[PDB]
Design a binder for this molecule. Structure first.
Ligand SMILES: *Cc1c(COP(=O)(O)O)cnc(C)c1O
Ligand SMILES: *Cc1c(COP(=O)(O)O)cnc(C)c1O
Lengths: 375, 375
């Protein structure tokens, strides 16, 4: 192999996909309940997306941000129209690049006011990216192992433990970074009470609330933005994964007053906001908005069916669900694979389900059927 | 606007490209000598690239590195074939993500060996990216302002000043990061003598040599990798931009021994190595190696014509050229634009030229004529 050994790849290779199914060279069909880790929001070979991309490829792939990028304005408008207040967007290429932008925006925001707030409070079991800024925010030392020193200023509180947050907070704290639901961390849900308090603290202590919606964003949980389940009012949010339906894209959306700190030359990206990614993003956002009622309906159904299995605690909401097992779930992933079902195991014993947002109840029953056979 | 104000965009809206030409919303035609900052290596609507991408879009966009990605193997193989020794590749989505991966690999490398080397020496006027790790390596304080503290351990020496390197090198130095030719910094060329000694220092002081080829890589300077002009032997190189011909992609290539340190779970990327990016890279790499002789010839032709204008010092190699003017080049960019020519101004007074690698002499003459009339 000419590739570095940083991944633990499953012994399977796909060549094509269509709808919620993937196929290997052998022609064997696989029901996809991982969607490339919540990236293939519209499944594979989605007609509207496929046709749009084929057209864009022949027209213009990239010109860079040296020039005006109208397509960025169009997509941004659709993202901001769903935000709780007036806001602006900066486009990136991935979730980690998006979190990086949010951290830089938060720090410069206070510096612009002549205030020395540069610290951040994130949470244990969180995952915000692998690049240095995002890695420092990621509350999992195992991922830090060998790369220290990280960016100074990051401390880790505990999810649903408001007291752990108060303890790490001081007058030098720029922001609090959190995932409404921690995906990679085991589909851990921040409670309404905790989130409500977290918001109050940010208003009270004058600290920015930064929500990482890279995994929960764009309809994944049953609302366009997961923060909307609790009427939260984030200062900045990070987005990626499902936003591009398979095409690499990322973005941060900040409220007007905060966005102002991203002045000319303060930050940028070469590939960021290229016409291909924005074309894909435009298709996805319009489609997810129409699918939301279905995502809520199919999601509730899927959660109910999981509870019926009586094989562990069911976590999450919408189509970001988990099944906490008593044993390590690594082996179940292999057994499901042999049976033509793609599932994921994270946090050691939590099966993570991230099917495409176009998933139907019939496909759900098919997946539940396999689970009942292997658990 | 719905976009943050972090860019200083020229008032031109492109909508389509064909060959080495771009067309804006008014249908006006522009000869592209910037190629989106050296990204559109094969120009726009390149037949072979377009057909390959359209075919890929219909089949598979993304599966994630949870599974085997054969397309990653194929592209890596082609990139390693041109490397000076045996190595491995890690795929990212941008140049900044690539430099970040390199910094991480270098630090973990020494940790695996039981050693305490975590510092890096980079150079003034260098540009390696905007995310925290890369931002720390970037030797331009103006890009740091408001974002500190950065990742600890970075110091900046002076290009072609070997003594400035010694004054910063100690036993805790993990590696030296450099651009063979600093593009963004003003197309600054590292001398053969300097690079020779720098290579010497690394071997004798036992420090890793990391060359950032995001801008110089993939044929831009006449050779597949710019370091080949000096028979250098880097431990790690970073690539991006032109590698994808317009599609976002990035990567680091490291010789076998260093690559070993990227163990399972140590690093990763959700979008990294997706089939769309790899299909693009595969086409570009095959086409570019066939263009190398052409790049060298048209490149030398262009450089000579630039010298003939007698309007400044000509810098660069191959098709990465610059013209250092007596005063700011801000206005000339606009004047050239008005005359249907896209050029770039960097380092305040350096006009940078990065035409597509398929550019021909007839096209060069066209650009030269415009330059003669405006300079
Ligand atoms: C997956 C994920 C990331 C990383 O996204 P990348 O595109 O791999 O950089 C960051 N934050 C959260 C919450 C994620 O789920
Ligand atoms: C352009 C450039 C980068 C940044 O690449 P991005 O994709 O914008 O992160 C890094 N290093 C060098 C040498 C570059 O020219």
């Amino acid at each position: 192999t000419y590739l570095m050994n940083n991944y633990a790849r499953l012994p399977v290779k796909f060549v094509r996909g269509k709808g919620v199914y993937l196929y290997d060279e052998e022609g064997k069909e696989y029901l996809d309940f991982v969607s490339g880790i919540g990236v293939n929001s519209l499944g594979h070979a989605y007609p509207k997306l496929t046709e749009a991309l084929k057209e864009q490829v022949e027209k213009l792939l990239h010109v860079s941000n040296l020039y005006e990028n109208p397509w960025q304005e169009e997509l941004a408008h659709k993202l901001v129209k769903h935000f709780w207040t007036e806001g602006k967007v900066f486009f990136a290429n991935s979730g980690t690049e998006s979190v990086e932008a949010a951290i830089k925006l938060a720090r410069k925001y206070w510096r612009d006011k002549g205030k020395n707030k540069w610290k951040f409070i994130s949470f244990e079991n969180s995952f915000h990216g692998r690049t240095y800024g995002s890695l420092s925010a990621t509350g999992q030392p195992k991922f830090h192992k060998g790369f220290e020193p990280l960016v100074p200023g990051f401390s880790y509180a505990k999810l649903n433990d408001i007291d752990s947050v108060y303890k790490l907070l001081d007058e030098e704290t720029a922001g609090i970074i959190i995932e409404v639901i921690q995906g990679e961390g085991g589909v851990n849900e921040a409670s309404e009470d905790f989130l409500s308090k977290l918001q109050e603290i940010c208003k009270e202590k004058d600290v920015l609330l930064i929500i990482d919606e890279v995994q929960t964003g764009i309809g994944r949980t049953g609302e366009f933005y997961a923060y909307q389940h609790f009427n939260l009012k984030p200062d900045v949010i990070a987005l990626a994964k499902g936003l591009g339906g398979g095409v690499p894209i990322g973005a941060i959306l900040a409220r007007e007053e905060v966005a102002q700190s991203f002045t000319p030359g303060s930050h940028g990206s070469t590939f960021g906001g290229n016409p291909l990614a924005c074309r894909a993003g435009t298709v996805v956002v319009d489609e997810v908005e129409k699918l939301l009622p279905h995502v809520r309906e199919v999601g509730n159904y899927f959660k109910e069916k999981l509870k019926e299995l009586g094989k562990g605690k069911v976590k999450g909401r919408g189509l970001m669900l988990g099944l906490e097992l008593e044993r390590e779930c690594k082996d179940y992933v292999l057994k499901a694979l042999e049976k033509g079902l793609l599932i994921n195991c994270t946090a050691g014993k939590v099966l993570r389900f991230l099917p495409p947002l176009i998933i139907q109840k019939e496909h759900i029953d098919r997946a539940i059927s396999v689970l009942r056979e292997i658990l």
